[PDB]
Design a protein around this ligand. Structure first.
Ligand SMILES: *[C@@H]1O[C@H](CO)[C@@H](O)[C@H](O)[C@H]1NC(C)=O
Ligand SMILES: *[C@@H]1O[C@H](CO)[C@@H](O)[C@H](O)[C@H]1NC(C)=O
Lengths: 49, 48
């Protein structure tokens, strides 16, 4: 069984900035009191969202 | 069967059959903790 919809408007796709938002730990290596420079899939700062 | 391992800085979940021995402190020894093996002096520590 599934619910149903109608008069559902199309998505509007308005866009915002990921202002420094969404950093994450890129790997399982424990690090402490260090600076690590790394190439990975990150969401860029001020990316469109 | 393909066994895929990982050796992270995380609690040991599977181990080899090695017998285990008492701690020796303040002496230079070989050591093997969870397969992490080296040589040095073991002491109590203030580390958290
Ligand atoms: C839907 O999109 C239009 C432009 O395509 C925009 O003017 C409008 O504000 C959007 N809807 C909402 C609720 O923001
Ligand atoms: C998408 O990104 C570019 C540069 O990141 C920006 O100029 C543009 O304004 C963004 N999209 C919208 C709808 O503003």
């Amino acid at each position: 069984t599934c619910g149903t919809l109608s008069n559902k408007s199309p998505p509007n796709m308005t866009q915002f900035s990921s202002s420094r938002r969404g950093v994450y730990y890129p790997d399982d290596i424990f690090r402490s009191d260090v600076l690590h420079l790394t190439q990975d899939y990150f969401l860029p700062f001020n990316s469109n969202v | 069967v393909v066994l895929s391992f990982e050796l992270l800085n995380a609690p040991a979940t599977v181990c080899g059959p090695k017998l285990s021995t008492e701690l020796v402190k303040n002496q230079c020894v070989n050591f093997n903790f969870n397969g992490l093996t080296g040589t040095g002096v073991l002491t109590d520590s203030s580390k958290r």
